[PDB]
RNA sequence: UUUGAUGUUCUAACGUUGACCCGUAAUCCGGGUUGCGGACAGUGUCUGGUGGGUAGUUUGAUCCGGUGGUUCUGAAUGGAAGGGCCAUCGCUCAACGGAUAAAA
RNA sequence: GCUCGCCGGAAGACCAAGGGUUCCUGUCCAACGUUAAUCGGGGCAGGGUGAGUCGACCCCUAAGGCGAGGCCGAAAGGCGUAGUCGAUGGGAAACAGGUUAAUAUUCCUGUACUUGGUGUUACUGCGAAGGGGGGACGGAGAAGGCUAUGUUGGCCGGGCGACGGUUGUCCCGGUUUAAGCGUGUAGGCUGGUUUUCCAGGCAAAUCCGGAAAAUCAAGGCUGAGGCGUGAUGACGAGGCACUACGGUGCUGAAGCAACAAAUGCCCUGCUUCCAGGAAAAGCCUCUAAGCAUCAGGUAACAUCAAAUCGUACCCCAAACCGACACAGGUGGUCAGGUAGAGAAUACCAAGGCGCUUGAGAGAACUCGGGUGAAGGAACUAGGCAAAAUGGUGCCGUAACUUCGGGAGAAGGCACGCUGAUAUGUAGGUGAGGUCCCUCGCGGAUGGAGCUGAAAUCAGUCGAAGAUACCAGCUGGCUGCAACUGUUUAUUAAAAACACAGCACUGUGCAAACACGAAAGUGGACGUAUACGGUGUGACGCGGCGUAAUGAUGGCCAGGCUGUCUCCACCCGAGACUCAGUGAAAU
RNA sequence: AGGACCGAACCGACUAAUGUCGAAAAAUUAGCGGAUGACUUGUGGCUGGGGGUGAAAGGCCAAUCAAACCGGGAGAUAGCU
């Protein structure tokens, strides 16, 4: 059975990329809340 | 033209066709031609309004000319075409000016006739004329309801409304409905009606025809559950099945009479 | 003379998801013209009815006090309203020590 | 290195997505490989990714997103125009051979091709977010020419060979060559040339469209393939000389005909059907504004540039998703020989592997199978499972029926091989010669040669010739449901859901209905022969019947058999012993 | 031409067996139905939690659905263990 994961770089960073966080003001939120706590990768990216 | 096919198969058993000879075994003419994204039922929300919508051969958009602005320019009907957008056959017309357009085509309408648009033109079926003066008690379609607008009224397969009385400014048309409305003088109406009248013989068969159409299937009230529908009354707690809705008292001016 | 309810007509309020032109290579939008309705429709507050479509719940007590007398008191003074004192009265509120005025 | 076995429409080769050096070499068994391992997709060191022609990048855009102004909303924010993103699509160009331990359509050898800038030469009107053509399209199906590809034959080099014969109609290996260039054929599309005029193409136009005429009847467009150049070039079986003994250098004969032939090309072709089958950009043309001694464009020549990014490796898997080196899943392309209708099936070429525990014995028992005396469902809630037929050709096929179907109903007989018909027939293809030719890829004779079913007779071997794999059990009664189809992913596939049809009701369009405080949307760029809701579910009169249909419920009959009387033997993995690693619930 | 017939790839799991601390947190073998469409699939987007979608089973919404997951009210409350 094909597993729920199927991995795509395009619709990985066209739904969790940086800019698109940043589309929406409460992506931003989320931003400033991952940078407040100090987590190295900010998001998912290459 | 009406024929059964042959009960070969399921399928093919409960199968009518409404066959038209005289349609135009061809590609429509490019220039008029435009597309037709289908939306499946959604909205600019992207949820679902209205049910039972989805799928569908592919279809594209013609551009009929209904307003008929071209006043006083004899044309030629050369050919008639399938419009997959309406259930009535469209018609191909060449002015003399030297340009192509669509209309409706009527019961008496074939290629290679004259038809002509304005005020100064025959009462042949067809024509464009004001309904002052075309003469009451005739029978006409795509009339229109404003000065310019267009035409609204009897534009389905074999559709007409019939000019029943003369009051001054204003005249009274019987619909298909039997309804009475009234509507200024100076809107346009065609001659005629509608052609393709046979609409009615074809019985699509099979599911697949709707389907491909353009319907989806329908499921029943009493088959939902509670949460999903109430179950005589709509999804949405409306009672049908005898309950009028029309609450306007803008155009109710302009109404003489009710469905009987 | 104030006039309102109603009837006919009209435009200057108002609608125009009618037409023409401009910003504009623009089905939006705003502006200028006109026609169509027009004090109708619609909108804001209030109110009569419907409203498991939705939402919160169930399966002589007591609260309220009717009347009386008593200036006991009555929030600046004098009244009045509201309270206290004595009498009586309205519910088999009987699920009768009665958990809500209000629930299958 | 030699044997045995497996895949071979894949268990082979390419990719797309997805991983990120797992790729090659040197080096070691600290930890992993369900055991050892000197080995590895493990540890450390080094090397490896070469693009004008591959793709990304870039021009345009569909679905969709953002959204200057603007509308609406307490704010947040929601919608949307001009515009901007957004390939899953449309635009320009490369092929053959060779090379490393890893790159090649990127490097080397040869032939080229495409887009723009610069300068010269001879001409000329140029000039758009504007107009016109094209780009630009569905389903199904048949034929013709083709090609990739494969068979045979001729030719070339070799062989005559350890168990009988094999200088012969014998055997082995090769018999390949691209893109570009010119001819442009088979085929398909379309009637052309000239003049005059027109409120049409939101301005104009020599461009498109329309109307008139004089002229010929041919022209024009598209178009695979083949033919010569590409190429007396590369490649080429095999032999020769050295080998760090893995391997490297030299050489190199022939490189042809016929047949069959595809899902790939002509073919976005052609014929029919209703379900009527995207948009924009590049591209050819017209002019507007402005300039026409300019500028710009055209045609030829020389030159410059074509940047940047990925280029290893896996990609039906050990490397991707499944926590695993997991019996699972992952889109497209190429995909040959024999028998075979077939990409099915059995054995193979090319190519890739024996799947990361084995060694002994052959207990009960478990798992998957083969055989079997008699009965042939007597076992079981139940023919559950097992057992049996299964293909081609000829004859024949009942009741019912909506006249289509039932039906492959059921049931009867021949299938192998050899010679003749016929030194392989019919059929298909088609050489050379000859005659014509509006002269080349042009039309007739002709059958050389190749391929080539089906059927009759006679003979012949076997217990059995659809002899292997593949491959319907059959009929009757009967309730349900029109049928096809879909559903409770992961215990209910059905009588349930849905369905074409039928009937009621509502909606007159700034329509009803629904999402939205409202804007605005689907309805619908439709409109009463249109759409929403409701109940039933074909057809004849929710009730009665209903042909066909059904992995539907039940019963019966013919065959069949290990279901059973009753199990018995045998074939493979466990179970048992030895060596190495090594959990669990409780 | 057939929402035609038999039948490969492909789709699903209707029957049987093994697998229940299995190779797999529904798997494998032979039968099985469709296999020109009411078919399937790659890619790219939209429909978001009293909400979406649903040929409708109270089914699915990332192994969790008669109301998902994440942080907070919150150390909710528990006449209960």
């Known amino acids: 059975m094909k597993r729920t994961f199927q991995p795509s770089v395009l619709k990985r960073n066209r739904s969790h990329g940086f800019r698109a966080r940043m589309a929406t003001k409460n992506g931003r939120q989320v931003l400033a809340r991952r940078r407040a706590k100090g987590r190295a990768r900010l998001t998912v990216s290459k | ?260």
């Open chain 2, 1 to 260: 033209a009406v024929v059964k096919c042959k009960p070969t198969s399921p399928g093919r058993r409960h199968v009518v066709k409404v066959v038209n000879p005289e349609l135009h075994k061809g590609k429509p003419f490019a220039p008029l031609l435009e597309k037709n994204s289908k939306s499946g039922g959604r909205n600019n929300n992207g949820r679902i309004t209205t049910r039972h919508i989805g799928g569908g051969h592919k279809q594209a958009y013609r551009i009929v000319d209904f307003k008929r602005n071209k006043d006083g320019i004899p044309a030629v009907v050369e050919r008639l075409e399938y419009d997959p957008n309406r259930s009535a056959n469209i018609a191909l017309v060449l002015y003399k000016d030297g340009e192509r357009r669509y209309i409706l085509a009527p019961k008496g309408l074939k290629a290679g006739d004259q038809i002509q648009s304005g005020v100064d033109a025959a009462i042949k079926p067809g024509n464009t004329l004001p309904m002052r003066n075309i003469p009451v008690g005739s029978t006409v379609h795509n009339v229109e309801m404003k000065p310019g607008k267009g035409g609204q009224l009897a534009r389905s397969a074999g559709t007409y409304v019939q000019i029943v009385a003369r009051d001054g400014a204003y005249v009274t048309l019987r619909l298909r409905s039997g309804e009475m409305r009234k509507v200024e003088a100076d809107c346009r109406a065609t001659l005629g009606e509608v052609g393709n009248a046979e609409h009615m013989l074809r019985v699509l068969g099979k599911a697949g025809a709707a389907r491909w159409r353009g319907v989806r299937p329908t499921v029943r009230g009493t088959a939902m559950n509670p949460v999903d529908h109430p179950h005589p009354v709509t999804p949405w707690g409306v009672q049908t099945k005898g309950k009028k809705t029309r609450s306007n008292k803008r155009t109710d001016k302009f109404i003489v009479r009710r469905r009987s």
